[PDB]
Every structure is written in C-alpha cells, then in structure tokens.
Design a protein around this ligand. Structure first.
Ligand SMILES: O=C(Cc1ccc2ccccc2c1)Nc1ccccn1
Ligand SMILES: O=C(Cc1ccc2ccccc2c1)Nc1ccccn1
Ligand SMILES: [Cl-]
Ligand SMILES: [Cl-]
Lengths: 290, 290
C-alpha cells in the first residue's frame, strides 16, 4: 500500500459563507466581531452564531476577547480548509495525507485527486512572529504571496527545463505540484557516483545565476534524489538577484554549502565548482517572471 | 566637514494631501483614477489636476494608461518623500544625504535633525520582482512591514544589550537609528587582534540563538567595526527560529561564513566556535517581540 489520505470534511454554502466572511473581516480586524461576520455572510436564515460555534468545534475559527473587542479569527486549519476546498472544486485535490516534509517557510503533504493519483501540496506559513512592543493579520497576505511567487517561479523554471516539479495549481497559501519520488539528499547514506550528483547540483546553481537568480538556501533539505540519482529542487523561498551588490557572496555561500555536504556525507571533493565570474546572464527572472 | 545633507523639498498642505490621496487610492487600485484622487483629497479650491501635473514634474507620482484603466501611482521617490516628510513633522529628520550603504533589501542614507546631528536612515525596498506569467501594490505593504519588523527587533535587541544601533523612529518603509561610526568588516584590511573581533562575532551568534534567533545572513557586509574594534549588527531581515526543523544548518552556516571571512582576510582560524548543542534558550523573540 501507499500513504493514507482522508477526503476533505463536507462544506455547506452556509459554512463557506461564514468562513469567507471571517476571512474578509480579517482585512480590517485582528478579531472580527460576530455582528460584522453576520452582515458580511448574510445567511438566508440568520442562524450565523450556530454556524460559528460549529466552525469553532471543527477548529476552523477561534474565539478571542481583548479589553473592549471580542469575536472570531481564522485558524491555520481554517485557512488550509478554504484553500483545499477551493482546489477540490477544481478537481485538483480530493484527499489529504500526513505532513511528510518542510520547506524553509512551508509544510509539505501528500494529496490525491479523485482517481487516487498522488501529488505534493505545499502550505506556506509566513507572519508567524507577533509584534507587541510598538496588523498581525499579515500571515494571510504574506502566505498567499509566497504561494503565488512559488507557483509563478516553478512554472517559469519548469518551462525553461530546470529540475523542479511540474506545478499544477495554487489557491491562497496552497500550491499543488508533481510529487517527486525519492529522498531529500540529507537522508541519502551512499551514492554509486557522488561526482555525478555534485555536478547536477553545481550546474543547477550556474543555470539559476545565468537566469538572474541565486537560490540563497541551496542545501541537502531542498534537493530530492530520485530512483535514477537525478536531483529536483522543491523549495526556493528567498532567492536573490545576481544584480544584488553582494550577489557574489550569496552565490559562493550556496556553492560552499553543497561542497560541505558532499565532503561530510560522501567524502567527495572537486575543483569543478563555479565562480560568479563564470556567470553569463541569459534571462531576467529576477526582474519579471513570464 | 562631514557628509553633505540637503533640507527636504518644501510641499504645501494641498500638494501633500493629493500625494497622500494617491497613496490611500493604492490600497484598492494599482492605478488610481484622477477623479478618485480628487474626491479622497477633497481640496477646498479643487485645483487637484494642476497639483497632480506638478507631482508628475517632481517625479513623486507617475501617469499610466492600460486598456481597462488610466490614472496615477506613487513612485519610489513619492513613497520616500511621504515617509521623510512624516518623520520631519516629528523633528526626527530635517536633511537627507547620499546613499552610503545597503542591507539585503534596504538602502542606507545619512540624515540630520535641525541641530545637525547625523543619524542612519534605512529605506526598505521589497516587491521589486514583477509577476506576469499568471496585486503589484505589494511593494508599499511589504516595504512598510520590513521597516516595522526592523524597528521592533532593533528595539527588543537594543533593550536586551545586543550590539545594534539605538532605533529612534520609523514611518512606512523608513527606519531612523543611531549612525555607527566605523567600517563594514568587508572593507577592513588589518586588525591588531583578530581573535578578539572573531570572539565578538561568535558570541553575537550564540546570544541571538539563546534569544530564539538565527541571523541567516550573518556576514562582513552586516557587521560594522567602530574606532575601538567592537562590532555592531546593522541588518537582520530574514531571521530564522531556533525551533525550525533545520535550525542547526542555519546556525552552522552563519558560523562557517564568519570563519571563512576571518581566514580569507586576516589568516585567523580558531576552535572557539559554537555548536547548536551549546544553545540554552533564555527568550522567545522568534515567537513574540516585546
Ligand atoms: O519530499 C519528497 C520526497 C518524498 C516522496 C514520498 C514520500 C512518501 C512518504 C513520506 C515522505 C516522502 C517524501 N518529494 C517532494 C517534495 C516536494 C515536492 C514534491 N515532491
Ligand atoms: O554603515 C555604517 C558605517 C558608515 C558610517 C559613515 C559613513 C560615511 C560615509 C560613507 C559611508 C559610511 C559608513 N553605519 C551604519 C549602518 C547602518 C546603520 C547605522 N550605521
Ligand atoms: Cl459551497
Ligand atoms: Cl455564496
């Protein structure tokens, strides 16, 4: 057997309206008053409070009281559900499995469509830090923006024959993409030909730089090795322009990180590693993604 | 003499209201129609079109026509002016000098108050990349958010006796702080005692980690050495939680970057470098800044 996946909880037009109302409410309120939710949701029967209590019970929204405001906010599970239900209505996702990895700022899950074909889901989680020494609904917008940027870059890189997953669809903070069957490099113990995997990694750094991009977090946690020892890049959250005044330092750091890992894990060392002076710009993906 | 600084351009309350109206308009529009700007500004004498032409002439806004829409948007110079004029009305900034450094995502200028005391200004510049392979008012919000986070972290770190500049004030994408007199480590050729500067750098990585933070970009471009060979951190845009599943890799990368620089520039090497296992959490600045 393969990984277990659970069908998404059923969602009524009522639940979706109230849930959407809470989301809209959070543009202008850290805690959305129950009266504002009721008027935005405008249910035909106006048992809005019953529906909210039911959404609390299912952990999709949470109750909070400050000094002189009290009401509701979307939970991570609520935001997740809105994204996954939207993707479900486009026949992209039917079922969700357990978390089976992380990016720098994302959680990675296996999902399946109605036919039981498996895909990778990335849920972006930004705005985690709270600021109180001076608004903290930045997490909705920032997470949505990461997912959008990941989908756009993944599409642009895939079309330019880079070793990245085929992106399928996105909504809010959720990106669905080709599942890559293999192991992150960090949990590979032996390889028949380390030189070959090292070369793929170094050629990927060069090709990114030739397109105007430095990964910035290039490592054994972001690179998956498949059944035929080819690498796929699965996370690129904070890429730097080759035009940055300190671009060379970022480029060298990514190169040194790969060298350090290949020495530690495989006792492999080489002189076939790029310098920034080798880069010949061919594209402008740091300026515009098209 | 010291660095040249120029008094901020004079602007009438009318001109400043129209520029603020364009900014408000951009909450809901990539391109703000002239009619919407006029109704938001609501000038007593209604010469709004004259004022807009004058703001174009001074490069504070730009005119654009698409197929669907035609009107105005804030320029970088316009956003800069709004921030600096606001800081000017609080007596924080009277005069602006030339750019004299960069952070990873910010431009650094010398500014002066009315008495001619010099300070550092950081203008945050995010949302540089354009996405067209599928809204682009993200640059206002993201830049504002970087500045806010920098001010908050700088205050929290300063109060906890970290070697950072004393933060003074912020508005929009602008942060004003203590000017640190010295050289970025990257432009230091010799030091009497490299071991001592290396130790300060390594103790700073440990103290950050003890407070829940990994810098993530710790380098010779972010650290300024003053007249008495003490280091000050002047940029920390993308800090990582010590709770990150790959926290150890980020911590080690910051340590290796300092080691590599001290070997390259000063031929200095040491075994007095921290490991992640040494860290004993003392604070929660990765979760909440207070
Ligand atoms: O991470 C992986 C490797 C992997 C594959 C199956 C797994 C099954 C069960 C548990 C872990 C598993 C890990 N792929 C990946 C990552 C991002 C995007 C696309 N694909
Ligand atoms: O970067 C510097 C060093 C420095 C000082 C004076 C300069 C004058 C002319 C030219 C460069 C200059 C550089 N300080 C700093 C940075 C961020 C925040 C606060 N202070
Ligand atoms: Cl529905
Ligand atoms: Cl509806």
């Amino acid at each position: 057997g393969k990984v277990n996946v659970a069908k998404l909880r059923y969602m009524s037009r009522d639940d979706f309206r109230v849930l959407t109302a809470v989301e809209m409410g959070m543009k202008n309120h850290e805690i959305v008053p129950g009266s504002l939710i009721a008027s935005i949701a405008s249910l035909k029967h106006g048992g809005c409070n019953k529906v909210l209590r039911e959404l609390v019970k299912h952990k999709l929204i949470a109750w909070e009281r400050t000094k002189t405001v009290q009401g509701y906010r979307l939970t991570n599970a609520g935001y997740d559900y809105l994204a996954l239900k939207t993707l479900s209505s486009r026949q992209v996702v039917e079922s969700v499995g357990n978390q089976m990895g992380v990016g720098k700022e994302s959680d990675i899950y296996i999902v399946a469509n109605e036919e039981g074909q498996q895909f990778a889901l990335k849920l972006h989680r930004l705005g985690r830090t709270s600021f109180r020494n001076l608004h903290n609904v930045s997490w909705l917008y920032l997470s949505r923006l990461s997912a959008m940027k990941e989908f756009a870059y993944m599409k642009a890189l895939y079309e330019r024959k880079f070793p990245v997953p085929k992106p399928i669809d996105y909504n809010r903070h959720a990106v669905v993409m080709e599942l890559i069957n293999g192991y992150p490099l960090c949990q590979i113990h032996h390889v028949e030909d380390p030189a070959s995997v090292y070369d793929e990694a170094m050629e990927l750094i060069v090709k990114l730089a030739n397109h105007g991009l430095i990964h910035g977090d290039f490592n054994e946690f972001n690179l998956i090795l498949d059944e035929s020892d080819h690498i796929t890049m699965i996370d690129f959250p904070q890429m730097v322009s080759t035009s940055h005044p300190n671009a060379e330092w970022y480029f060298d750091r990514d190169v040194k990180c790969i060298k350090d890992f290949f020495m530690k894990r495989f006792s492999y060392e080489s002189e076939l590693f790029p310098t920034f002076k080798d880069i010949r710009r061919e594209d402008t993906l740091d300026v515009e993604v098209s």
